[PDB]
């Protein structure tokens, strides 16, 4: 179980709603982002790859406000971050994001 999928547990079937490891709230969400962020010094590729899912959720939704206010919150912990990693978890969250939104949604 990833960080996330440990999180889901704790928080029964999936949200229809944009969500990660359950939580659909943007406070919740952003709790998460925090702990997961500010605890976890190596993060899995999984827990990474849900947060790139959780994202073009939101672009699926049309809720690109939302979308902007998680990029921007992760990108401001993850560079505060010692770790290099998390600076690089974050280029690969952007990337990946990127590779769904142009071929996608031709942007």
Do not use: H
């Amino acid at each position: 179980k990833s960080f996330f999928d440990k999180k889901r547990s704790e928080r029964g079937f999936r949200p229809a709603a944009p969500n990660l490891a359950g939580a659909v709230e943007f406070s919740d969400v952003k709790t998460l982002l925090k702990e997961w962020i500010t605890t976890i010094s190596d993060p899995m590729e999984e827990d990474i790859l849900q947060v790139v899912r959780y994202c073009t959720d939101l672009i699926e939704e049309k809720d690109l406000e939302k979308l902007d206010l998680v990029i921007k919150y992760m990108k401001r912990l993850m560079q505060q971050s010692v770790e290099s990693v998390w600076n690089m978890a974050f280029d690969f969250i952007l990337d990946n994001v990127q590779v769904v939104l142009q071929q996608t949604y031709g942007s």
